[PDB]
Amino acid sequence: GAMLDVNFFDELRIGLATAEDIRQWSYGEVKKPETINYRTLKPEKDGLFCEKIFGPTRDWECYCGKYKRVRFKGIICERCGVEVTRAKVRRERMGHIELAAPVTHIWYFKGVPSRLGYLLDLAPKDLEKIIYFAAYVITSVDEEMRHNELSTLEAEMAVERKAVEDQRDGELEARAQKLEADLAELEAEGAKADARRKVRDGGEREMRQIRDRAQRELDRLEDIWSTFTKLAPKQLIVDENLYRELVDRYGEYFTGAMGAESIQKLIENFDIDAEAESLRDVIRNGKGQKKLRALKRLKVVAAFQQSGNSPMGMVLDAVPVIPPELRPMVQLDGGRFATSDLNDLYRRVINRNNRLKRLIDLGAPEIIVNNEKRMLQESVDALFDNGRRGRPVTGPGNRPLKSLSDLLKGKQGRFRQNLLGKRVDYSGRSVIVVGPQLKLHQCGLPKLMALELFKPFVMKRLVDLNHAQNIKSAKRMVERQRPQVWDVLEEVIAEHPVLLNRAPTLHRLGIQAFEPMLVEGKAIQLHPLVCEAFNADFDGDQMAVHLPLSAEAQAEARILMLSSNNILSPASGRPLAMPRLDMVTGLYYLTTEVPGDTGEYQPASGDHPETGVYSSPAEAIMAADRGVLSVRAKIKVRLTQLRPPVEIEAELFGHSGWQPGDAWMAETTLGRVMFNELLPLGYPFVNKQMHKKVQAAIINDLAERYPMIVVAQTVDKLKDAGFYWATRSGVTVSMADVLVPPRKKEILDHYEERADKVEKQFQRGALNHDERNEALVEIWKEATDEVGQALREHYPDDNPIITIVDSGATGNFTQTRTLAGMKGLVTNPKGEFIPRPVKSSFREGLTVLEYFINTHGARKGLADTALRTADSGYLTRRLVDVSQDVIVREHDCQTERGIVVELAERAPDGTLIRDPYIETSAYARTLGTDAVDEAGNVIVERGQDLGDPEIDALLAAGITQVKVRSVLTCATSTGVCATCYGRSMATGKLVDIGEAVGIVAAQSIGEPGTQLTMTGGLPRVQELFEARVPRGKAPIADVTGRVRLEDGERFYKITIVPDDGGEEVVYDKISKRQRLRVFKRVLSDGDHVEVGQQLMEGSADPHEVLRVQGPREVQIHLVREVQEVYRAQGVSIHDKHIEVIVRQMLRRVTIIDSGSTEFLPGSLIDRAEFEAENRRVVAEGGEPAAGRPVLMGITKASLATDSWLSAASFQETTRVLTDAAINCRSDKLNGLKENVIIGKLIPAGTGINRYRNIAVQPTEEARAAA
């Protein structure tokens, strides 16, 4: 235990609290339903706010006011009774309520399954009748006294029954005498024989009433005798009159109570080991539903037996009281008080308890006391969880009161808020503007905001320099903004990084540090190259600025999270600080080449020489400053500062043509020389045309072969040159620049005539509605593509609308077709194609109906955008919640297993064509085995990074399949090892020994989900990670052999003939809307298919491919199916980000044979735990369990964790917390979710013990130097 809590923790053990611990935490029994005085506004004695119980409201003062000094501390006043202490002890001191009659907990009774009902084996609809005073129960029985006195008791029963028999025989004889007198007085006088027969029948009905009343009395006596024979414990006696008839007879032979005291007595006289071993015998010797119910009860029975708990605490005898600072009664300005909505529940409990105590002391009939105890029980139930049993207790205006459990569950609970995050000091936000003069590690700052962030720093600094006498005059000097505070602010701002942040933070680069520098105005200036990482444009977006404080936080923001340190993706490794929209156009115009421009080099040498050469780029720059040389004309310079390409270098100098002194001629433009001067010295000459993919390749090569600082400076230089030449490029937009195709109208008339013939053929009746809709859709698609082709071939190359597109700056060609040309088909609200279509363009201007048709697709796109970003956020939450505990732990696990990569299969001619999906699948991986070629030399040994040149060497040697290491085959138990993960994509080097690769993988998967524009969209990914059954479930085979393909009536009956002698597996309901799978041609009857061959077309459920093709092949299928989705949008995700998630699915195994070691069938436990005990239990008890690999989704595997504190935050915080409380489940605080909650240091990055305990001391040689 620990009550001071000085930051050293190992375990957080929950457990079920008892009455002794409840009355041992408490500081006094609250016994009045009073809160505060209405006149003097002070807490009442023995109330819900009492200063004797909870402590003093004012610091170091008793209630009567006798002691007021700190010298009196720790003592208790003699009169008022308040211990003098701080006023923060009212936050922590608890009190208890003494109930007059016991009360069941609502949590262990009204859940599924009901734990009280499982522990006693009673039905819940009978337990509800017991604890709500609706039916008695048999709390005890005495079988031996009934056993040895039952003869005398049935003798007295026979005596009473024969007395009833003699009494009814006397009654029948009296009615017989009266009917004899009726007959004698009827047949002696003149009377009607019909009335005489009615008189006789009346006497007969009288004696029949006698005999069936006697029969009913005998049935009552034999029924109470049958129940007294069958008197067993845990029996309900409904309607209470049989019970009252059964108490007064033989009260001394049994006891029967009603309610929570009866349940307490039933739990009191209860052995747990007896029903434990009985359920062991039943699950040993059972079959069917009986064994399943005995298993589901043995769960909670062995839960109560195995721990050191006791079942007494499910009935409750003392209720604790939460401290009054957590439920404060605060007044506002003006006396409008504000209570906290639990005080009403506590007041109802106190009132009904006091009334029950008064009723018991008074002495009342049973109806009043039972009604009062029922009301007490319902009050405690409403206090613990309102709205569980029937209708909730509501307040003013039919609003339900927030009960005590509603502070935890739901969206407004403590857990969901504490995972949602807090609000911070030292922060600020503003709108953002572009910062095109800053360096890459800089950011602007509005000085009126930076004066507010750095206020204690500037106060200390202008106290230290003598400008104010203390911090008070310094604070007033800051508030009045005297003109010295600006110089002091610059002095304290220099070299002190800040954090920048734009919500929503999608991935790891959403928070990046910067060095501030003061900027006039009021908007945050942002560097124009991080907009791609932030996903921020300048249409009015706002960014938050935080501030690191300590030395550790400053070092983390300066080294880890700097802007210029994060150039590449964490996902795919491509750079994010690449040039974009304007500077790409600038460099494209600067590096393109015009044939026959001004000053072009011609070699025509008749009377005059060539006049195209230039001795130096300085001479060329002079000749272009004068109006002679254009920048894009082809010349022949004599360069002496740029490295020539490989062919010219090997030609002219051979070994190393170190160009800092060497001279060589080159036929280029001036513009490519001016461009290549931005690049470093060691980088060779380029001599190309700077398309965006060419710049991507250049910056990728620079990031691969050079340090990071050279890449940052090169990117800054490229930004400056790109902007400066983007202005001079002359890319404007005029409506004389949006040219129409000349022969558009004849094309439209020709396709209009074809559409007219199709419409006339429909009007003849030769075809239905849908066929003519398909024909018109096909005709207008052909017309749209024809107009697009004519527009593509009509335009020149120097058109701005085609230069911006073809240089890869922005946009595609379809937007230019809709600008000039034809819009095309427009969709319906549902998704059908309107067959009209729009035959205009936005240059020509639409008409009214065409605009009205276009609006449908526009609004559908907008609503699709909103729904898609919500679903992407939810999927990112699920993935982070699953894979947060996969961190790198070791450097090399030293396994031998590994996956195999395809890696550029060959041609029918035999040539090794390069596979397109190499850079996502095979790159940045470490080889598990060696690479041998044609049984010759080993080209690339084991343990290498598989970058570019060794992949090129393997392809040059002519090998395809390679066995590479991956995180599916890693052998460490807690997280993955460093060699299995391979190269971290964000750095380019090997991953470190503290990285949190799970959250990196989860963010890299969940980030581009907003661009997934669609079962083929984001539900296709979500139904793959959840491992749900699909919709178009095409079947798979189980064994080889020719097929018995049979196409039945309206649905197919596909049977497979096995290859060997085996059964013929029949597939029942295969509807004709599904299609035959095409492979190697279409499917035919008798096709010799493989083992796990997909039968129809569609998507197989991965549960079936696991059970058929084992654990290796399902990992190949699950990656390739997800990676087929992201390739539809051209989104590049490396496969190791998906292989982390798929690794978390197959961690567990099912149990079919329990063996002899604490096991149950149907359980899913860890593979590393199932085998490890089976390593030991094969000796001394050698009944090994039978295991099999199972595949569970992300939502299922996230719940079954080892920490109750993490799983409480997910879902059903009621249900997660109650069964953890039964089992006394201790937590170990090892995931990085729990360490965030308690505020401890997380076990990742700079938090693990290899890095947190570094000793730092100066070198002993340099120690003596000063």
Partner: protein, 87 residues
């Protein structure tokens, strides 16, 4: 929460306590002793002139004279501008 800690007045109180200790140390030993025991600056109990004259072995009137002399000594601009700026 208007009854919370403003977190600048607390460090202002600590700085004021330190400056008060230095200013009282610029006086003599007996003067600082009688001022601290008069105003309870060290334990929180304001003693009277009887207790100060008991702990120093002199009349209550001598203690009162010394206290008035020290209060006149502290009421100087040179000795007290740094304390004037705290209010």
């Amino acid at each position: 929460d208007s009854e919370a800690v403003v977190a600048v007045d607390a460090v202002s109180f600590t700085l004021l306590q330190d400056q008060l200790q230095s200013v009282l140390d610029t006086l003599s030993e007996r003067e600082a002793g009688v001022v601290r025991l008069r105003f309870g600056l060290t334990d929180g109990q304001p003693r009277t002139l009887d207790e100060i004259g008991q702990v120093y072995g002199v009349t209550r009137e001598r203690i009162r004279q010394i206290e008035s002399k020290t209060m006149s000594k502290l009421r100087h601009p040179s000795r007290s501008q740094v304390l004037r700026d705290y209010l």
